[PDB]
Write a protein that binds this ligand. Structure first.
Ligand code: HEM
Ligand code: HEM
Ligand SMILES: CC(C)(C)OC(=O)N[C@H](CS[C@H](Cc1ccccc1)C(=O)NCCCc1cccnc1)Cc1c[nH]c2ccccc12
Ligand SMILES: CC(C)(C)OC(=O)N[C@H](CS[C@H](Cc1ccccc1)C(=O)NCCCc1cccnc1)Cc1c[nH]c2ccccc12
Lengths: 452, 448
């Protein structure tokens, strides 16, 4: 099974028996994809254990996998487990079950539903400032993924359930404590190492009631939703019930995906943005000059005022270029196809290296440098939407893209209106990415906060 | 009563006595709303006779009228008469009668009931192609609304009653096309407006706007169609608190809407596809990709076609067949920072908002890329309202969108459309009452 790409004439690193090419992950998925992109070119193949993975970098071929042949061939992602009841999660569901859940949860993030969240999100933006004002009036360096994480959890628990959990913190809020340990794919752990190298034990662990998400975390989330479901305004929890009037299980599964996504992805990218704004004070000042122009006298940010800020979107877009927290896009080829003049066998996992494409010198000038001017309307036209895919593409893209982009901008504004950010020497410069599994910094992002 | 907007400080054209502002309708409702939107920015008021009409364009205020305070203040549309037994129609009913009829007729267009209609609709799509193949093998220019209307009547009479009607000269299409034509030159719907206080006279006089020998003919056909689950069956089960009349009133609305709205928009779409062959070809390339070897369109393959939805959405932007949205303010309110008196008709100029330069780049041009997933997030759902919004929105929106798409697929799979010189280019909209072309849409049909 390790002679598939040798047969197809597709280059790639020589796989070791059983392991495949997983030993090359010692520097992370990023550095492995960047090296393979330069070593073999537009298309290469490798093996995660006994599983062949074909990597494509052609925009037309990426457009075919993500959009053109999504419903017919490239519908599902790589099988993930053991998940237990989480198999019904929208990000894990396959084929028919995903198509029903995608249409059920699509009206959650419309332009109207999002516009209803702006007055609600505006509350915790002040709690975010008041919590930062305490750590700013006393010169105390600030870890950001904590103060950004507490704000993100308050938004997702209210925009989707209408409940207030962290009521001004409450820094040991149980949701944030449990959600931060819902899952950390560490390749050092021999669990996830075996899960990939040896994939036939997943049915063993499924009947063994084993779950990658710790039982103490799922329970706390499983019983909180049953606590949140007691008897409106029409949000994520409401859409599921009015159509349930689904099950008590699949309803909990989708809530866990929304709670994690709204917390981890929002807080991590916000920490990546503030690091770039601190290391580039010229960009931070120019961004502060635009916020004061659209919103004078520290005016509260509204739905339309956020979409007007051109430079705020450029800072968000450039940071998502350097740090695509998804790293990769994966689709499982469900049947034999010949896309763009290339045969792809059934079962092959088609992977799009987003991190490698976002830093390809053949597309970006000085790819390692933070330059928000890449996304200006003077130059945003010179960017392929299939090379820069921070939220994916096609029918199975990021469903909370418009919500995540709005909320992050609502937090950036209401912060940069009151504070400027400076490094602290105890701040890691340059920022090392996590050489482990997920895209995070090695040392947590710390920065000095000064009040304006 | 002509100093209401002068009192409230709301701008608007100076009304003439009795007439009000109706003599500005000489260019149509659409050109009157576009001019008033540019001169009387954001909010303006005018009079349809002695009836004050407040026009709003703010998305937050439109959302408040159509959605938030719909059940409480803005529940009913403008009063219309004389109507007779048609007062029990869902689109004419008011307050309690509408709420019961809206809940009664809503399950007609669920995702399951619509999915049941695809195998039935797929029959007349072949008859639509076979009737077009005769007028295509001979080089005869085709009147699109004629061949599109015969298909629309077959669908509504089977999806709602289960009867097969159109095989040429069909009595249903012939009568339904005459059911109502609001012509402002025509002096009845006119005086009805300048003089709305004689509507009661003609009521106790048994008089109506829909021709007697059109209503009778629809009135006896339903009694003929009722002999022993669809739109018809849903009501007889609640009759066994509908009556032998209110059931007939709802059937007339479903038959008219399923015929005129479907055929007219389908004609508007094929005109834009013939005047923009690049969009027509690009749409044909997507249909052959989702449905290879001319595969029959099913429920799921229709919702997959992204470009087909973008073409339908852009055509509905340029030609919103309803033109306006109207709600009657039933009690004094102060919405979004503006006082509105009781009895004022709140109007949303859909045609004017769909072509507003503060919202659309080159609004007069046909660009389906406005509704691509990349850009459709620039579109306010309260500016682009081809089916309205709120609890009293278009109840047959999901049915009309599938039916038109099911017809566009089967037609574009077999034929390409070209102008015929005798085709009106550019297309003039009807300067009269309803949104239609002046000259009928004629195009050349070539077989692939
Ligand atoms: C900076 C913030 C975020 C980024 C960069 C991001 C990125 C992504 C990407 C790249 C994908 C996969 C797309 C593909 O495979 O083509 C994805 C999927 C998904 N995202 Fe996000 N996301 C973010 C925030 C959020 C938020 C706030 C939510 C809230 C619910 C969310 C929910 C989801 C879900 C449910 C999926 C799976 C969709 C499916 O399988 O159909 N994401 N995200
Ligand atoms: C392209 C096709 C169509 C368009 C653009 C359209 C548009 C509209 C609009 C704008 C309204 C007014 C909504 C409001 O005032 O908020 C409406 C109402 C209505 N439509 Fe249509 N429509 C179409 C086809 C149909 C079809 C096929 C039916 C089949 C039954 C239908 C039945 C109705 C009914 C019954 C109402 C009144 C609902 C009520 O008053 O509660 N329409 N439509
Ligand atoms: C490399 C690792 C093992 C880390 O992840 C995977 O391999 N597990 C998925 C298959 S289920 C996945 C399971 C999950 C649930 C909660 C927290 C974390 C993990 C899931 O539910 N995820 C969406 C959760 C919320 C979210 C996150 C980020 C952005 N938006 C929303 C496959 C996958 C690999 N990379 C991806 C990038 C995007 C989407 C899916 C994947
Ligand atoms: C400018 C004029 C006077 C022409 O029209 C109005 O002012 N009279 C209505 C108040 S009753 C209206 C009466 C009616 C009934 C059958 C056929 C035609 C007319 C009615 O029931 N029509 C719905 C029939 C089904 C349908 C048609 C089109 C699209 N979808 C469904 C006010 C009104 C203005 N625009 C509208 C759009 C939809 C519904 C009502 C209105």
């Amino acid at each position: 099974s390790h002679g598939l790409f040798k047969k197809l004439g597709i280059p790639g690193p020589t796989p070791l028996p059983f392991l495949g090419n997983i030993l090359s992950y010692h520097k992370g998925f990023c550095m492995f994809d960047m090296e393979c992109h330069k070593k073999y070119g537009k298309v290469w193949g490798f093996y995660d254990g006994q599983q062949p993975v074909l990597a494509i970098t052609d925009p037309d071929m990426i457009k075919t996998v993500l959009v053109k042949e999504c419903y017919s061939v490239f519908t599902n992602r790589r099988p993930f487990g053991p998940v237990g009841f989480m198999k019904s999660a929208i990000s894990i569901a396959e084929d028919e079950e995903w198509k029903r859940l995608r249409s059920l949860l699509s009206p959650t993030f419309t332009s109207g539903k999002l516009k209803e969240m702006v007055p609600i999100i505006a509350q915790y933006g002040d709690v975010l400032v008041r919590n930062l004002r305490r750590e700013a009036e006393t010169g105390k360096p600030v870890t950001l993924k904590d103060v950004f994480g507490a704000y993100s959890m308050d938004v997702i628990t209210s925009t989707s359930f209408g409940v207030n959990i962290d009521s001004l913190n409450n820094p040991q809020d149980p949701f944030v404590e449990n959600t931060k340990k819902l899952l950390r794919f560490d390749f050092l752990d021999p669990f996830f190492l075996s899960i990939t190298v040896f994939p036939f034990l997943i049915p063993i662990l499924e009947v063994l009631n084993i779950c990658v998400f710790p039982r103490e975390v799922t329970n706390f989330l499983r019983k909180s939703v049953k606590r949140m479901k007691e008897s409106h305004r029409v949000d994520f929890l409401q859409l599921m019930i009015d159509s349930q009037n689904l099950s008590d299980l699949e309803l909990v599964a989708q809530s866990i995906i929304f709670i994690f996504a709204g917390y981890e992805t929002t807080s991590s990218v916000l920490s990546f943005i503030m690091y770039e704004l601190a290391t580039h004070p010229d960009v931070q000042q120019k961004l502060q000059e635009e916020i004061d122009a659209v919103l004078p006298n520290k005016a509260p940010p509204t739905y339309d005022t956020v979409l007007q800020m051109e430079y705020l979107d450029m800072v968000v877009n450039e940071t998502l270029r350097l740090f695509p927290i998804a790293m990769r896009l994966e689709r499982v080829c469900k049947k034999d196809v010949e896309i763009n003049g290339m045969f792809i066998p059934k079962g092959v996992v088609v992977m799009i290296p987003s991190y490698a494409l976002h830093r390809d010198p053949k597309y970006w000038t000085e790819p390692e440098k933070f330059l928000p001017e890449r996304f200006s309307k003077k130059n945003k036209d010179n960017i392929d939407p299939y090379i820069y895919t921070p939220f994916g593409s096609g029918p199975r893209n990021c469903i909370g893209m418009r919500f995540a982009l709005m909320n992050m901008k609502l937090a950036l504004i209401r912060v940069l209106q009151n504070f400027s950010f400076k490094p602290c020497k105890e701040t890691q410069i340059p920022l090392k990415l996590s050489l482990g599994g997920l895209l995070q910094p090695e040392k947590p992002v710390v920065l000095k906060v000064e009040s304006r």
